[PDB]
Design a protein around this ligand. Structure first.
Ligand SMILES: NC(=O)c1ccc[n+]([C@@H]2C[C@H](COP(=O)(O)OP(=O)(O)OC[C@H]3O[C@@H](n4cnc5c(N)ncnc54)[C@H](O)[C@@H]3O)[C@@H](O)[C@H]2O)c1
Ligand SMILES: [Zn+2]
Lengths: 5, 289
């Protein structure tokens, strides 16, 4: 699950 | 509660709902899948970027789009940018379907994960858009004290000359205004999310695998009675999407090409001619330069 905070 | 607004969980049902007085505000969530037919590859497709990054010898694929690695080693990203940059940006039938939604007064907002600016080019205004992951259109020096802006032409000249873009003033790395993995989404994303979804009557999700967060979780932000239509080559988002369980009541999956899905939906609404005219006219205008 890739994440751009 | 979970009111049932669709008569049947089909594209036809969705069209019938859209034709009803209840459907006033549509929110589109779109990803790389709506631009692949324009010539821009996605991440996951078996053609996808993640299947062709071997030559860059990354510790892992996603690293090429991670901010730390980019700041340490920007070269792979810009090489990939040199290879992937289309000869021309033309919006797809899908983009213009969203434009048509705007012209019909149905479009509340388009939330996009894409950075190709094709939504703007298709004629969606800045007010109509939430560019959740930024854009390639403008660029900025990474120095906090300088933050010099650079236009797309400057960046393209740098990229095609195979020179790593450096600020002509403070000499810092120049980065496209893309939200890299590990970076924060713009404030507009969250504010618009806080305002729009309490009044959305229909969620149209197109060309995304719904893997990247927090964008994907947007689907859970809609009211429980709000119908959600996925137009995508495969099922995604499974408050997540529920297409096939016995408890399915509002989610519809139309599997195929985004352009074809938008054509079918437009046809069901009696908009096909309008859509085709819009696409041809706008394409002609673009070609005329
Ligand atoms: N055009 C762009 O700006 C671009 C290009 C490449 C990657 N990205 C990033 C990839 C990232 C994740 O978004 P996401 O959309 O989930 O990429 P993704 O690769 O994770 O998923 C794309 C989804 O769309 C589907 N798809 C691809 N082509 C079509 C088509 N013609 N018709 C229907 N479905 C199709 C595909 O099966 C997949 O499920 C975003 O943050 C983007 O910024 C953007
Ligand atoms: Zn600078």
């Amino acid at each position: 699950r890739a994440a751009x905070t | 509660q979970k009111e049932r607004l669709l008569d049947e969980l089909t594209l036809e049902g969705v069209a019938r709902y859209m034709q009803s007085e209840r459907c006033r505000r549509v929110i589109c969530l779109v990803g790389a899948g709506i631009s692949t037919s324009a010539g821009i590859p996605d991440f996951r497709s078996p053609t996808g970027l993640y299947d062709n990054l071997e030559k860059y010898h990354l510790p892992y694929p996603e690293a090429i789009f991670e901010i730390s690695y980019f700041k340490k080693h920007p070269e792979p990203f810009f090489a990939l940018a040199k290879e992937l940059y289309p000869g021309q940006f033309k919006p797809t039938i899908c983009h213009y379907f969203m434009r048509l939604l705007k012209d019909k007064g149905l479009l509340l907002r388009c939330y996009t994960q894409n950075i190709d600016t094709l939504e703007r080019i298709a004629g969606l205004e800045q007010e109509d858009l939430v560019e959740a992951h930024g854009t390639f259109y403008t660029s900025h020096c990474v120095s906090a004290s300088c933050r010099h802006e650079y236009p797309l032409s400057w960046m393209k000249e740098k990229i095609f000359s195979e020179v790593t873009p450096k600020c002509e003033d403070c000499q810092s790395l120049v980065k496209p205004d893309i939200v890299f993995f590990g970076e924060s989404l713009p404030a507009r994303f969250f504010s618009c999310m806080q305002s729009d979804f309490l009044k959305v009557d229909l969620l149209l999700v197109m060309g995304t695998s719904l893997q990247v967060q927090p964008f994907a979780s947007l689907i859970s932000k809609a009211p429980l009675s709000t119908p959600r239509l996925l137009i995508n080559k495969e099922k995604a988002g499974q408050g997540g999407m529920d297409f096939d369980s016995k408890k399915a009541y509002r989610d519809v999956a139309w599997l195929g090409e985004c352009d074809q899905g938008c054509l079918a939906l437009a046809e069901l609404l009696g908009w096909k001619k309008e859509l085709e005219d819009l696409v041809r006219r706008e394409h002609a205008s673009i070609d005329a330069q």
